[PDB]
């Protein structure tokens, strides 16, 4: 028997089989309807089609269509029946319970799962290493989340939340791109966009001295090449964009950049613990893929926590699936096979078992 | 010049690695070969504590007691019984007959 | 034309290694890797506090 | 040169006849992935064996195609031999007679399909195939006696006499190696260390090898090691974690004595040996009696013979001479036996050649093997 | 002026920088000492050698001898006047190719040289330095897949079947047609009605249907000696080993499963840019149709909505060179040469460090 | 404090425990017209010098007395009867040889204490093991030494009379062969420090001789004495070259990976994985750079495909022997290990045996 790992992203879903190493399948979180068709294949009809987004800011809010994502993932992407199957389940940070216990009912009733559990994203994202104590910076298509955990359990006080992820910063590279005057408003220019995000930018070590090398020289230019076969030139947008996580007040916002809001989390934790989550602060998600975010990161928490505090940042280059990647491990434990829930013991407690047994 | 067994002699020098190599910059603090010595000790002695006999050692065919030339003589004399031994090997009826082949059909193939 | 601007814009080896593109080790080195990672996990959350 | 195959439950030895050892010892195992990879194409490398199998355990199901010294899984056991010509042995089939090993009690068509599967499948020029117990009982210069052949998956007592074994009073026993390291996870267990994990089982065999014995008088060892500390001795686990064992070294041995200790209602392996020797004819008693050799992983613990001896000298006539014959060599005695075997002038003979099988088949093996 | 050698299993091309082709091509074959065609001519009296096989290569005093016949022969040039780009074979050794350094500085006294990947060259050619690529020659046949002109050596797919077996397998099925074709000569015949006539079916069984129904894809060959012969579905036969493998008892899979095998060993992220651009290179893959017929296994392979585009130009027997040509003739390539100084300075070390 | 002491074929190796080196390292020479080790070299030119330690094993009795009194009187200034001493030995050291030793420490230095160990087992216990295969190569002998829980196992042990002694002679040869002459003792000694400090061994022998003969990056430069300057190209690691094909110096003996993986062949099977996961380097002659790489390439290249090799080779190997009898000698379980002079008193030399295995 093997056991299925489902990362449900507001973005990006990541699927796959417990002990694989990468997810088998990864793919859009939209649901399509004419004005039904699940993510790439939706993605393909959009123009004859309305898309609906079940995942918002990592909770599920429509039902109807994460069912139909569930059942495209275990029918048309994995290829699975998924009766035959235990199947660990992601879920954010500060999750409510009447959501994971709706997660639970239908893996159950629908699905007729032999087995079920629900982790939090960003525990997964500290087992996947290995870890069980640490501070999480999980930043994906949705939303950003900095989760301590000690010995395995989330610290709920302490968690940080930021509605500026990965879409937010597409939209402010399209609009500085625009204020330059190549014009990207569309939706398909969004895309060209958001690949021109994944390939050319990078978090710089000193954003003003970097501004500087910007407007020195042509050194840090990059030139990319539109499907039309237009050729554009980028500078510091290269850095200016994924800046926004450091400076929010780039697109409007009044809260923190994530480097203190790491160190916020990190003072809302007991302090004997603090030492413990300095050295060990995970990066997790694509909106953490960016090179040099982790320099970064290290040079601002030693800015801000006292001078000899031990800083260590672990930020893997798989660390943009790691979560998943941890779910597949813990999936793949002997001594995880009792803790799944048992399709007898739902029907034994209800919805209610998943509190009890999942933590 | 002077200057020339100097040139020669900066265009020779290692990298920092290998005189670490070789010993001459340690690669560590002298508490931390304080800390290894201390733990290579007690591993030691708690081993040697647990160390077992010559006999111990030679009953679990490690430690070979015959030498070369007197293994060397037993396995010839094991190999000579067992031809020896081998072409004096009775037929399936002669055991039958001698009650020594209790069932019939058995080792009737033969 | 083209060609000598896609050359400009190369990556290092190194900054491809940083998007996973380019593996840092053998198969055989991310398996046993895995492996401790498992009795790591398993040997923690064995004494796993209340 | 010939080659010579022992084909056990949990260990394949293979390796050069007239060599001293096995060139080559891996486990009988076969692995094949737990869901279709994603790799299309003709010529997937599908299966796993051996070593390389054991450390990809994660990734793929694993079966055992041996068990309990009989083959079941014929496709697991061709890769089986496959992998011991071309990758361990790194020879060619086609170019070297093959000596195989089989259980005791062995079907005829189990045998039969072994003969068709190594002359159809391997091409050999020539094969035969041994009992493992004859085997070992040749390898200390006997054709008479009784063999004790305790494994990973079965323990068998067969009495042989004049190199024929004697269906009639074999007794197979399913308590062996792979049992005793259950029973050593289960009691450390119950004294609390955790060895649920399959490392951790890897960890408590190494233990039961490194560490355990046979108690010359169990109540007085138990005595013993409730008395003070002198029994007990320490085990470094890899993670450097460093744990103390006491009974449990000579307490998971005990257990081919008193099978009871798992459960199990059968007579121990002395009252099987006895009973062995009794459905043997009165005749040839004292000449099995004299003559007890002990093969196998499992008779490797120290102060089982002297145990045996014990045991046995109090089961049989108080003037019967009891010897009881356990070499250092003993747990690859088998396989040394074949290599022996396979090397003597005298079996050249005795080789079921290609064209012998081209005109008798399958049935071939009955009449020439014996 | 620099120059460009490219070193096949079957065919040496070689020629100058900034050229549209090579300017010499000859088969890369060496006589016990003769080279190329004059080998295959004296080919009787003396028997003949392939210094590189699997586009590896083997006999380094051979390859003295062809690279010898290149510089003086063929070119007509002095090596220690000309910077030389070499190219090798995916998955090369390293001792391999610091060997090439070695005999390229110390015995051809040359002032620079580099060392390309052949797939990498065929990827450039097209102006692409993201792909993947199928690179079919006459000894051996690769994907590399390659991303910002770096090939991922984990991905790399090797396959030994190549244009000459394909020659042989026309030669076998021509012996089931009942005419027979042993000879070099006559393998030479053979090669050439190969390039002529054959090509790769859209749709295998109903081109087998097709030829089965009547004499329409039957085509004729007028042979040197004036006799004319008749060959119907070794057309398409021939190629299909490709996918096929089978046909001549190999276990390997097809190119089309190959490629895609090639595709998923690599990272889930770069698979779209992958797919979107297929460049095939090499003269095994020059067969009428087959860019078709590999853009329908891919499609049907690949996610439903993933876009597959195959680019296959006419140029693409030489491309590998071409690639080179284009390569070596760009300012921005000047610093990249190893120089004979660095050479001498750091030794054959410095071939993996430069070239990459 | 216990006393330590190496014995070594070209230098003695002495100390104090607990030190986590040597106090003491000198040349082991007896010089008559008494002087010993560096004094006896200073003298060199008013008397010629006897080796007393050739090839691990001690052979001139007087002579060995005569480095002992230097090792405890002159070099480490203390009253042998105060100190109980570890003494060094030689794998498969003769029974008489062992017994003289032990005799002659009770008898003569009237120590309280002392214990015999072998060289390579202590090489081991330096790393904190007790089953592995050690490769000790010093001045005038090398050694493949397995050993399972501290017990050398003496069936399997290769013996190689090539050493570093005999690799500065080589390199004297090959340096002449180009031309620059270094016949006399002193110039002996400049070629020692050459080969100490610019040889090396090569990963791959005949891609680096291509490299030395295709250019000038592997050439070095020495400045003699004289303010002469040398250049030495390939000799670098052709020197060295020669523990791997003996036949460079007309020997028929395999090399040093081919006795490591008969050695570990020459042991039961089961063992066998054991030995290949601990390969432990020991001596001045294993200092080369590039070794421990080309050892993992040679033995890869012999043992089994799924085999796990290792190669142990801290920094600090060319005393690690001394450094293992440090450690055990200072060891409080190691204190009962002792043969005390009441027990020798009451069964002799042959005491040594029993109480040292
Ligand atoms: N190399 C890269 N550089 C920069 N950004 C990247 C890179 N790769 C992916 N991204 C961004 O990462 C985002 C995907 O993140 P992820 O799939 O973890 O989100 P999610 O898990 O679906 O969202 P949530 O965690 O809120 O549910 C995309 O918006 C993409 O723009
Ligand atoms: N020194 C030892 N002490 C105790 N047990 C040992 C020792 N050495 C090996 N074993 C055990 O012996 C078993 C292997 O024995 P062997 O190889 O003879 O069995 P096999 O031939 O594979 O099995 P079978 O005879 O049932 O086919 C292993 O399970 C191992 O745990
Ligand atoms: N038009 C064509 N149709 C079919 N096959 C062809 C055609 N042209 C050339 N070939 C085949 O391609 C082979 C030569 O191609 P190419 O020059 O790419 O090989 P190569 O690069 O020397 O080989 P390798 O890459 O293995 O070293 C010959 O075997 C020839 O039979
Ligand atoms: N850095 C170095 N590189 C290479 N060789 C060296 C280095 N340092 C010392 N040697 C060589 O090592 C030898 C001394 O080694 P060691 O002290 O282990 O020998 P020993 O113990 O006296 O002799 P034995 O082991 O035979 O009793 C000298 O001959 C010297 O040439
Ligand atoms: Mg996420
Ligand atoms: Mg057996
Ligand atoms: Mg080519
Ligand atoms: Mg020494």
Redesign the interface.
């Known amino acids: 028997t093997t056991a299925l790992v489902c990362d449900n992203g507001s973005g990006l879903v990541k699927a796959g089989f417990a002990g694989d190493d990468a997810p088998r399948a990864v793919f859009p979180s939209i649901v399509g309807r004419p004005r039904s068709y699940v993510g790439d294949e939706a993605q393909s009809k959009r123009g004859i089609l309305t898309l609906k987004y079940p995942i918002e800011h990592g909770i599920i809010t429509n039902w109807d269509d994460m069912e139909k994502i569930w059942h495209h993932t275990f029918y048309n992407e994995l290829r699975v029946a998924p009766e035959e199957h235990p199947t660990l389940l992601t879920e954010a940070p500060l999750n409510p319970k009447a959501n994971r216990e709706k997660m639970t009912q239908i893996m159950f009733e629908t699905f007729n799962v032999p087995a079920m559990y629900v982790a939090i994203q960003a525990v997964l994202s500290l087992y996947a290493s290995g870890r069980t104590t640490g501070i999480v910076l999980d930043s994906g298509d949705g939303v950003t989340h900095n989760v301590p955990i000690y010995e395995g359990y989330a610290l709920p006080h302490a968690i940080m939340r930021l509605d500026l992820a990965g879409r937010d910063l597409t939209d402010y590279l399209m609009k500085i791109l625009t204020e330059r005057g190549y014009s990207f408003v569309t939706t398909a220019e969004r895309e060209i966009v958001r690949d021109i995000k994944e390939k050319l930018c990078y978090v710089a070590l000193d954003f003003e001295n970097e501004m500087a090398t910007a407007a020195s020289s042509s050194s840090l230019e990059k030139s990319y090449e539109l499907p039309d076969g237009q050729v554009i030139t980028i500078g510091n947008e290269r850095f200016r964009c994924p800046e926004t996580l450091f400076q929010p007040s780039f697109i409007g916002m009044e809260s923190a950049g994530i480097h203190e809001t790491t160190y916020n989390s990190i003072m809302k934790c007991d302090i004997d613990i603090r030492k413990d989550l300095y050295a060990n602060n995970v990066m997790s998600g694509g909106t953490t893929m960016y090179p040099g975010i982790a320099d970064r990161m290290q040079k601002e928490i030693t800015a801000l926590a006292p001078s000899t505090m031990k800083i260590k940042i672990i930020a893997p280059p798989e660390r943009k699936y790691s979560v998943w990647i941890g779910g597949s491990i813990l999936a793949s434990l002997s001594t995880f096979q009792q803790m799944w829930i048992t399709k007898q013991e739902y029907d034994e407690a209800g919805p209610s078992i998943v509190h009890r047994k999942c933590f | 010049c002077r200057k020339d067994?100097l040139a020669?002699?900066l265009?020779?020098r290692p990298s920092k690695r290998?005189l670490?190599?070789?010993?001459i910059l340690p690669?560590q603090t002298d508490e931390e070969?304080l800390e290894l010595?201390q733990?290579?000790?007690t591993?030691?002695?708690?081993?040697?504590?647990?160390?077992?006999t010559?006999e111990?050692?030679?009953?679990?065919?490690?430690?070979?007691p015959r030498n070369?030339q007197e293994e060397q003589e037993e396995?010839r004399?094991?190999?000579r019984?067992?031809?020896r031994?081998?072409?004096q090997?009775?037929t399936?009826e002669e055991?039958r007959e001698?009650?020594?082949?209790?069932?019939f059909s058995?080792?009737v193939?033969?």
Do not use: M
């Not at chain 2, 001698?98 to 069932?103: E, V």
């Open positions: 067994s020669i002699k265009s020779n290998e670490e190599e070789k010993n690669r070969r010595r733990q290579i000790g591993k030691l002695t708690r081993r040697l504590s647990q160390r077992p010559a111990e050692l030679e009953q679990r065919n490690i430690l070979k070369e396995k004399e094991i190999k019984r067992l031809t031994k081998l072409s090997r009775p399936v055991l001698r009650k020594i082949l209790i069932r058995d080792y193939e033969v």
